[PDB]
Ligand binder design. Structure first.
Ligand SMILES: O=C(O)[C@H]1O[C@H](O)[C@H](O)[C@@H](O)[C@H]1O
Ligand SMILES: O=C(O)[C@H]1O[C@H](O)[C@H](O)[C@@H](O)[C@H]1O
Ligand SMILES: O=C(O)[C@H]1O[C@H](O)[C@H](O)[C@@H](O)[C@H]1O
Ligand SMILES: [Cl-]
Ligand SMILES: [Cl-]
Ligand SMILES: [Cl-]
Lengths: 559, 555, 554
């Protein structure tokens, strides 16, 4: 399973994940026995490599002929792909998909091999020792596609809420694999309503994007938390062959807009009742199956949340599909957490950030659940060099998506110099956990400073992180910190304060569940875990579960 | 995902599971909220139905035209299927697959609804209050198939090991949905080798089976735990339809006290494993299953026993591919004589055996068929039921051996029937007898005073409780250190017991049970796992791994 | 520490406990290591004997001359005492005190050895495999007393509440260790008020008791939960003394009422075993008070001593804090056949005799219990209940008596006690609504039993919970289920017309016997409101809300 829906009926495709591959470590001075191992999966979950860091090899066979495409939804975190023993592609960043295109391969059985690598080092500026694990392995799915002469790379649909109703445009990208000129047509339908026909002329080996006008969609019903209506959009490449290729995605008609201090969904003023959620599970690493995803979402919905924040990297497209279908709002951000100014000066940092953003928005553009793009969680936005990166990455996002609001979760308390750029100002604060200041006092001081002393003034404002730690099981009448009883007190006051802060659009609690972290963080991280889950790593509700549930269920999605 | 491989390239099929359906409980007078629930799944894992027992409705839409088949891999435990508001199908038993066939439906969008029921009462003779959970919901997958005039119902392949090498016969069942006579052909290949072309004749609306002969397979490599080579077998109906399954070339038979796999004397290093998980109920995804199997391989085990019911075919697929030997039994546990006298018992055991063996016939990992775990094999009425079910199996699968797990310590009157004698025993957990002494007294009784004398012998259950996290220097029962003492002695005795073929540890993980069993079941769990319900290893995990890993697959 | 107050100022005494003795197990052929072990203590808390059941030896030396007395407050459960190598004394039962008296021993250093034994078998009718632990060792204190020619063996003070106010009578037992006739006086004071001077005549080696008359005590303030005023009572033999503490309080039943100083009492109680993961049944002063402070924090006003007499230092603390005590002889759940053990009646009568003689003066003890959940539905059992009730009345004619029954509508012994008491477990062992279960049982007692019209207590109600096991399914053994159960249970008992109150089963989790493992997760009884480490379970708040919303009287 790759999506909750079929993205192709014309194109010949086959999933090569949901299978056992042969797995062995490489580059050790140990026995490198070959085992059978699941794809998707992480090798920290296989008994023999439970604390392995480095390189390992995944291999299987496939049968194909002609032009083919190999799509990897995620490889943790550095990949080398080899077909029949020849290097054919490479990738960095565990959380975005990439592909390999191979022209006119001999028929029959072929050998596929993926070297996955989760080493830390100078070549890796995003995956570093951090307050979340960098797993290893083929953590999301793999798809083999047999292509014709030319194929559809992506389709991007934008709805528009005009005075007279719903409009929309579509942009399609076509890649000519043939050395000759290509003439054809792309016909677009949305939900079996006729939309557009884009005539196609492509030179040899050219990839080109084509756009429709802004067209009426009087038949469209809107997407919202209360009514998450989705339509299948289908684009068909027609050439002298015939219906040669297709691409199918899903869209929701919804408008996300900022106006003053208001985040507006379909004209209504939005209240965020959110959770920060990592892709982490003690059996599945970051390769969580559909059943584990939906189990998280039912707990999150049971807590009364309307939104998730993808800390701190793009998410599996299966998960975003599930959020589309259930009306869950998504803050999605590029892969970065707490990188210093010196980390951002790594020779690869800008290129790696650029590649993450490009793949994230190119692949995830159509998800109506995504309402905001985040960047550079808690990076050095108080420095001049830090500002330079923020500026570039913000404007990279505008060039890819000129319509969704942008933001970045900050912790430079009253020293941020990058608040002028984004549409939404966002802050991570931990009064009552890391600081013994009353939550109301701390939040008021920060908020006045943003309104009076920063270029963030007048913009909508979110607390993108607040919460407290607690070790499940540890309970004492002393209510000391790390006890479940103290987490209850902390969250009750924290949620009371954010929901009472005039000008604040809501909150993401840090965080949904407990998370495995890197070993170097053990000094401040009991159990080598981040312990601020409202549910523990096995999804057992802590005492604070009821406190969060009482808060979130007592408020609606709108102001 | 339904199988680890594609079962169709010609038949038009689409998975209707791996999706959210609309869900609500039924049996009340007001508004019940409609929630979006995962299929496959158990409603005990949905926050608002965590302890619900009764009926509930699952529903979605699909697009289809003409003759269609809806295949349900598992609905826990009683199902009613309605298409476009009309009841079209029924099933009992949570653990066997079943299908609905509809002729010439109008084109377009249709409404599908499943009423799932996990209630207890007189209608249900297999799902009772018991020492495992009877979940509710669409706990395995659902497949839409668009059919034509006729379709291949199943295909059964049987390998035969002769003095000159491998042989095999195939038997195909074809169903004619047309009221006229059908003429056609069925082309069978195994691993892209030409096997047979059978001409077919079916009268109107008839279902008939057709067999090849025993043909030579000089190309076949064998299947074993060391080398689980598999082949795809393909059957194409030309009249337009196909069916694809997987086979291994391997021989299971008993001879004297020996269980022989390809003529080698087999040693079972097993775990009893329930389909139970704290997040997934009995509806475990591919990822969870492989996680269990990797732990089980890490423990040195070479076999699993499917306590106490048939298993997901995706799980059997994974065992085939990895060389894991499988004891699969019909759904029954610990039924007394009076439970077995329920007017539905014989029908429901018979339906379970027929659907189990017909659907699973080809898995090379399945080496034995079990029946009626700890049922009333000490009574005449019980013996009557054992006899019927043993002969039902022989009619469906005349080659694999049969057994049953007994707890009728020196009182069983049914040991003459099976190919293998199996006993569940718990010395050093329920009785403070030394294991060697308890197992010796049992073993000499079967041999000197029972009709099971001279047959192969397994310990199908042995083990001890341990609540994860409870440890004391006193080594009291339920402490993890006591499970260590108990499992060492237990495994040492079984592997040293002359005539015993091996052992299934009770059990792999901790398992949720029914509330009525709470009094003897701490946490309303079975705590005899070597890993707890969250798959964390107890202290005894090391003891089992040192034992199993010191031993190979054969004597 | 033996009591919270000094019991002698004239008598020469020294505590031999609060020390390390030499300890080794016996019953083997080789060399057993000798270790320095604590007395008081249980060997199940010593690392090398954590599961030891059998005999063991405890020994130390002492210095003494002349007539001496060795008082042993508790040896679990069968004791043999040797001085200088010679068998001098025997006891059975872990929970009652006993003494050895030695006439004119040579002066100097002496060897004392105690052989303790916690074996189960035919010689033991009370200590059996059961739903609590039979520990081994010198689990309570030990006192050396150096005596003269006679000594005061005990003193019993009884208050009487009359129209004009408080009266009292005292009874004193003097033991003559001399072979000749003895003459003297006994001078008794209560709270430095003059009380009585009794002239004493004892023949040779005679033990005789002497009674004062009922005398006015117009200075006496009364004892109660609200005001636990205590007085020291002093009896001086003229050469020897004995001191004890009394409270002026009247316990009475009248109709369906239990009256404490005329006020209708409401019991808000806990069953509490003498059990601690570190200290076995040998809990120090500090651990007792920690239990008592949690018990007061929960809003309770009473404890029930399941299922045996308690340390006198614990009883002392209950006197000082106004905690009402139900004390019972040592027995739990013996069947008719267990009761037909040939030592059963001897060992019950010894327990009742040692219990009431030692504890008579504790004003906190308001009722005497017997034979918890024994065979009160059989004729042989009713024979035993009958005997033990009348023995109690012969030793204590004034406090009410009872027994905790589980013979739900089959008890034939309800005619005997002053108070009818039942242990019931609806919503734990039976899925009946508590009010319906309690109403069915109550109407039967009123309409169909000889217990009709008498005061009525629920002496056990509660539910299991393994600390730390929590789930949204609220299954049994989860802490969330124990919350639900106790809420309904306490709602029902406190609303049951005719019911005087409740003892929750039980305060804390308790180690039990290995044979009970099948129904006892962790080989523990998990029905505590705190766990064995005194950590509060979720249901702690439920009990607190219930008990703190109710006073001590109706
Ligand atoms: O302290 C914490 O737990 C958090 O601190 C920051 O807010 C960071 O963004 C998180 O990743 C997490 O580490
Ligand atoms: O006691 C136990 O745990 C077991 O007893 C029997 O052996 C039964 O077959 C098991 O299902 C389980 O109930
Ligand atoms: O079930 C229980 O825990 C209780 O049963 C009886 O009421 C008995 O008096 C208690 O000692 C305890 O065993
Ligand atoms: Cl933390
Ligand atoms: Cl168990
Ligand atoms: Cl218990």
């Amino acid at each position: 399973m790759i999506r909750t829906f079929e993205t192709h009926k014309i194109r010949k495709t086959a999933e090569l994940s949901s299978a056992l591959w042969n797995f062995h470590t490489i580059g050790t001075q140990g026995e490198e026995a070959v085992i059978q191992a699941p794809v998707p999966g992480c090798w920290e979950n296989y008994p023999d490599t439970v604390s392995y860091r480095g390189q390992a090899s995944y291999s299987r066979e496939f049968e194909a002929k002609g032009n083919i495409r190999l799509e990897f939804k995620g490889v943790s975190h550095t990949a080398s792909v080899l077909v029949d023993g020849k290097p054919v592609g490479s990738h960095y960043n565990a959380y975005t998909p990439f592909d390999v295109v191979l022209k006119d391969i001999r028929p029959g059985i072929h050998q596929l091999e993926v070297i996955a690598d989760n080493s830390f080092g100078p070549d890796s500026a995003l995956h570093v020792p951090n307050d979340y694990q960098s797993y290893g392995g083929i953590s999301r799915g793999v798809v083999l596609e047999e292509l014709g002469e030319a194929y559809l790379s992506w389709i991007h649909f934008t709805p528009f809420l005009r005075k007279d109703g719903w409009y929309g445009k579509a942009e399609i990208c076509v890649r000519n694999l043939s050395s000759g000129r290509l003439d054809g047509s792309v016909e677009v339908e949305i939900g079996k309503n006729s939309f557009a026909v884009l005539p196609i002329v492509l030179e040899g080996e050219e990839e080109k994007s084509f756009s429709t006008e802004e067209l009426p969609c009087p038949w469209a019903e809107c997407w919202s938390p209360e009514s998450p209506v989705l339509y299948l959009i289908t684009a068909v490449l027609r050439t002298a062959d015939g219906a040669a290729d297709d691409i199918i995605d899903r869209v929701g008609f919804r408008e996300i807009r900022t106006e003053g201090k208001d985040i507006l969904l379909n004209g209504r003023k939005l209240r965020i009742k959110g959770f920060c959620r990592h892709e982490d599970h003690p059996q599945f690493g970051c390769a969580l199956p559909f059943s584990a995803m939906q189990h998280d979402l039912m707990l999150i919905k049971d807590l009364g949340a309307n939104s998730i924040r993808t800390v701190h990297y793009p998410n599996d497209e299966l998960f975003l599909d599930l959020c589309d279908e259930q009306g869950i709002l998504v803050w999605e951000e590029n892969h970065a957490r707490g990188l210093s100014e010196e980390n951002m000066r790594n020779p690869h940092f800008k290129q790696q950030c650029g590649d993450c953003i490009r793949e994230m928005i190119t692949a995830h553009y159509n998800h109506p659940s995504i309402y905001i793009w985040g960047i550079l969680n808690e990076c050095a936005s108080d420095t001049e060099y830090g500002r330079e990166c923020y500026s570039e990455q913000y404007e990279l996002i505008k060039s890819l998506d000129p319509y969704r609001p942008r933001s970045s979760a900050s912790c430079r308390f009253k020293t941020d110099i990058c608040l002028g750029y984004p549409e939404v100002v966002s802050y991570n604060i931990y009064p009552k956990w890391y600081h013994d200041v009353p939550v109301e006092d701390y939040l008021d001081e920060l908020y006045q400073w943003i309104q009076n002393e920063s270029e963030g003034t007048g913009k909508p404002f979110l607390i993108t992180e607040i919460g407290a730690g607690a070790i499940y099981g540890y309970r004492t009448p002393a209510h000391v910190k790390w006890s479940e009883e103290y987490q209850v007190q902390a969250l009750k006051e924290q949620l009371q304060a954010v929901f009472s802060r005039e000008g604040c659009s809501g909150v993401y609690i840090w965080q949904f569940c407990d998370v495995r972290v890197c070993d170097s963080w053990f000094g401040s991280r009991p159990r080598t875990m981040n312990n601020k889950g409202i549910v523990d790593e096995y999804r057992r509700p802590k005492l604070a579960y009821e406190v969060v549930k009482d808060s979130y269920r007592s408020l609606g999605n709108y102001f």
